[PDB]
Write a protein that binds this ligand. Structure first.
Ligand SMILES: Cc1cc2nc3c(=O)[nH]c(=O)nc-3n(C[C@H](O)[C@H](O)[C@H](O)COP(=O)(O)OP(=O)(O)OC[C@H]3O[C@@H](n4cnc5c(N)ncnc54)[C@H](O)[C@@H]3O)c2cc1C
Ligand SMILES: Cc1cc2nc3c(=O)[nH]c(=O)nc-3n(C[C@H](O)[C@H](O)[C@H](O)COP(=O)(O)OP(=O)(O)OC[C@H]3O[C@@H](n4cnc5c(N)ncnc54)[C@H](O)[C@@H]3O)c2cc1C
Ligand code: SF4
Ligand code: SF4
Ligand code: FES
Ligand SMILES: [Mg+2]
Lengths: 463, 279
């Protein structure tokens, strides 16, 4: 076939406008643009299409794209049919189309990307979900699902309201179970609500899923820290099965001297203050946040990018200080580019030796070790760079405090819950998924695990 | 949906008791544990100690001293108002064994915070001496309540207007210099007070536990806002404490970290006061 090699671009807000707020940067496709991009797809057979194999849950990508093309003159029918196909495998397309690292997944596998730009699969999936939400088409499909629910009288508890737990809960409700989600924070959503900022994941997208759960008859109990507020044994007595979706929410903090100086935040604290507590709107909102004139962000993943771009919106000059090379950064390529555009400065092959303070206990500088290349090793050369604020973003890990209290639960040396081929833990009737079993991973994997665990719970309770 | 205020009691100027409906927290709470609260959708999360529980009513009791915007706004709440979010019980329970003679030291609102710990110590068979520290007579509260769970109570006021004149530490130093048997000191109060208690007992080798009061946000171990240095190691107070060996705590670091947001705290309080001037 002949290939149209350039992607149809998505519009984005200007840098000068968007660094003044936390609003979404990329405005997504319109119907006309999405249809044009869909037309670039070569419609590889489903039995071999490499994009499908690259999607961790194997969405029928050519199929939902074909649904757009075959309904060129009826966008509502096009979007309804496309979303029906996507929902066969993915509960969260408005989110994953925005946040998957597609270059490592569907788009990195697309044939057109070998000679040009791959099909913009994430933005097409996003468009389908967004258009559906704006026009009530998703509500139509959801009501169709709700009509088919036959209550079975059994109760399942979900621990944690991130993408794994939210997805598991919705699928169990569609199977007829009475589901309660227990969530420690005062709002559900997990990383979707406190971690990823509004400039790439608007809160309305998460709130829509909570509205869907309301319509599905799922109950959500916030301010419940399972292990303290309610014990695990109390849940086992009350519920027929349990799904653990507690994520990997503890910060990794290396024992650098000076790490407790004022002005040093974990990324989790910085992002929770910004995103969950709306500290960027202080004093309209009561939670404060403090950034100095120069901010260092330690790390190179999505967490680091989100912290850096949030700090830039608070007025700082911001540096990413990363211990490996540019090519090894794990953040989404699209967001690294956005950070560059917005003015984040980048330094590679450096890692902190210590943080240096002033008399009042405030951060003043970082002594940095230079690295060389296979793991990086220090060259022995060090230098001192002045900074007012630092944000540590070198990874997160599960909370061993919670895990050790769960009686009978087997956990590996990295804090990951051990599960079998059915996602069942060492405790019969207790299942787990998402970052709780993988360590830090992706939204699409957490969603996929929630669906797989819901099916396993149904099988377990039906036998 | 939210957490009903069952009862409010003004214990002293600026010291407000709230009894809150929360059967889950009441069922599980142990002495030394705390809650995070948020008043309303624009609010911040703040930690407050569980000062009492009533399982028969499904309630917990918190006592909040007015020190800034959130606790001043809380002080205006009435019975039948609601606290939007209450998360608990948080932290490790106080470690209650038979030690011998336990000196419980509460400074200011810390007097409410020590009540459940003093009561548990007494129930375990300890001889309990409670030192209560107040700035002046009109701030004295819960003397009878602490006496009900103590063998001896010593009330101090900075200005000598009631009880013994001086600080908590003056009463403790007097006990030490009398040669009184003291097997454990527990201190709860302002960080400056807990530091002073720790520094007084260290040369005498008296085991001393302090309930630390660093900045908290989530209160569940996710973020390190509440971190402290204990015996040269970083700990998160909300999950590893909040009680620690007072002689191993970096007190100057804790006080530095507690001062960090002072300017913004003032801005927020001033906005709240400015916007309620007209009447
Ligand atoms: C800053 C940041 C940016 C990211 N960006 C991306 C991205 O662009 N693309 C991508 O694919 N992935 C990204 N990720 C990773 C992705 O967010 C996670 O893999 C995903 O959120 C995992 O979902 P989960 O539900 O399994 O875990 P979580 O979302 O962490 O679910 C845990 C939730 O349950 C609650 N909970 C936890 N423990 C308990 C308990 N004991 N009792 C009660 N409740 C509890 C908590 O409130 C928490 O919100 C990012 C992660 C971070 C931190
Ligand atoms: C585990 C724990 C238990 C506590 N129990 C009680 C109690 O039973 N009764 C009581 O009156 N107070 C208690 N406190 C202290 C209480 O949290 C603070 O006084 C409160 O947050 C002040 O907030 P504000 O907005 O009213 O004043 P702000 O202006 O916000 O702060 C005033 C002072 O409180 C401290 N502070 C500010 N923000 C926080 C925060 N997020 N967390 C902790 N401290 C902060 C600062 O050091 C500052 O000096 C406790 C603190 C902790 C950590
Ligand atoms: S889910 Fe992530 S991977 Fe699967 S298609 Fe949508 S974007 Fe590509
Ligand atoms: S691979 Fe690229 S082209 Fe072939 S189907 Fe999947 S998307 Fe369309
Ligand atoms: S306050 Fe977030 S870790 Fe203790
Ligand atoms: Mg405050």
């Amino acid at each position: 076939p002949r290939l149209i090699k350039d992607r149809v671009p998505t519009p984005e807000r200007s840098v000068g406008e968007r660094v003044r707020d936390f609003g979404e940067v990329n405005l997504g496709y319109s119907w006309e643009l999405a249809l044009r991009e869909a037309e670039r797809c070569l419609q590889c057979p489903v039995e071999y299409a490499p994009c499908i194999k690259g999607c961790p849950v194997h969405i029928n990508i050519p199929g939902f794209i074909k649904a757009l093309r075959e309904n060129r003159d009826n966008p509502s029918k096009a979007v309804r049919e496309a979303l029906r196909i996507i929902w066969r495998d993915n509960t969260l397309p408005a989110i994953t189309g925005r946040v998957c690292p597609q270059e490592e997944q569907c788009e990195g596998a697309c044939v057109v990307g070998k000679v040009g730009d791959p099909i913009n699969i994430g933005k097409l999936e996003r468009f389908v979900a967004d258009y559906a939400r704006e026009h009530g088409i998703d509500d139509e499909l959801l009501l169709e699902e709700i009509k088919g629910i036959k209550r079975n009288g059994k109760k399942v508890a979900i621990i944690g309201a991130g993408p794994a737990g939210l997805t598991c809960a919705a699928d169990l409700a569609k199977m007829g179970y009475e589901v309660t989600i227990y969530e420690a924070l005062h709002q559900p959503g997990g990383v979707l609500i406190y971690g990823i900022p509004e400039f790439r994941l608007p809160k309305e997208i998460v709130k829509k899923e909570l509205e869907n759960l309301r319509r599905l008859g799922v109950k959500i109990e916030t301010n419940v820290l399972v292990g303290k507020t309610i014990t695990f044994e109390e849940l086992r007595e009350e519920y027929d099965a349990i799904f653990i979706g507690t994520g990997a929410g503890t910060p990794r903090i290396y024992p650098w001297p000076g790490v407790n100086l004022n002005g040093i935040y974990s990324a989790n604290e910085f992002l929770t203050r910004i995103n969950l507590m709306k500290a960027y709107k202080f004093p309209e909102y009561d939670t404060p946040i403090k950034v100095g004139k120069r901010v260092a962000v330690i790390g190179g993943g999505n967490t680091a990018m989100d912290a850096a771009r949030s700090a830039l919106r608070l007025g700082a000059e911001v540096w990413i200080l990363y211990r490996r090379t540019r090519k090894e950064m794990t953040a989404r390529e699209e967001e690294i580019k956005h950070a560059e555009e917005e003015g984040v400065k980048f330094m590679f092959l450096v890692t902190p030796k210590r943080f240096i303070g002033d008399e009042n206990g405030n951060l003043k500088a970082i002594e940095l070790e230079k690295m060389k290349l296979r793991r990086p090793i220090p060259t022995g050369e060090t230098f001192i760079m002045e900074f007012d604020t630092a944000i540590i973003a070198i990874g997160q890990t599960p909370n061993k405090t919670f895990l050790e209290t769960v009686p009978g639960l087997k956990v590996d040396e990295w804090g990951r819950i051990v599960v079998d081929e059915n996602l069942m833990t060492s405790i019969p009737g207790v299942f787990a998924g998402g970052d709780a079993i993988r360590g830090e991973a992706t939204v699409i994997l957490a969603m996929g695990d929630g669906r797989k665990a819901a099916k396993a719970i149904h099988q377990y309770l039906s036998k | 949906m939210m957490f009903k205020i069952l009862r409010k009691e003004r214990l002293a100027p600026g010291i407000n008791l709230f009894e809150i409906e929360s059967p889950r927290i009441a069922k599980h709470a142990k002495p030394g544990q705390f809650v995070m609260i948020r008043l309303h959708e624009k609010g911040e999360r703040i930690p407050l100690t569980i000062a009492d529980v009533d399982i028969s009513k499904g309630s917990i009791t918190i006592v909040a001293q007015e020190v800034g915007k959130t606790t001043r706004e809380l002080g205006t709440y009435e019975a039948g108002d609601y606290i939007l979010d209450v998360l608990g019980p948080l932290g490790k329970p106080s470690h209650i064994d038979y030690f011998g003679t336990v000196v419980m030291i509460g400074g200011g609102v810390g007097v409410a915070e020590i009540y459940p710990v003093a009561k548990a110590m007494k129930e375990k068979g300890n001889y309990v001496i409670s030192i209560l520290g107040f700035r002046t007579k009109d701030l004295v509260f819960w003397e009878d309540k602490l006496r009900s769970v103590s063998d001896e109570v010593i009330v101090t006021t900075n200005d000598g207007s009631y009880g013994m004149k001086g600080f908590t530490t003056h009463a403790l130093q007097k006990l030490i210099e009398e040669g009184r048997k003291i097997d454990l000191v527990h201190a709860v109060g302002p960080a400056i007070m807990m530091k002073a208690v720790a520094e007084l007992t260290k040369p005498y080798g008296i085991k001393t536990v302090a309930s630390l009061n660093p900045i908290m946000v989530d209160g569940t171990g996710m973020c390190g806002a509440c971190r402290v240095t204990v015996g040269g190691e970083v700990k998160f107070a909300c999950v590893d404490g909040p009680e620690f060996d007072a002689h191993l705590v970096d007190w100057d670091q804790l006080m530095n970290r507690l001062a960090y947001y002072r300017d913004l705290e003032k801005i927020s309080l001033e906005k709240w006061e400015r916007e309620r001037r007209m009447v």
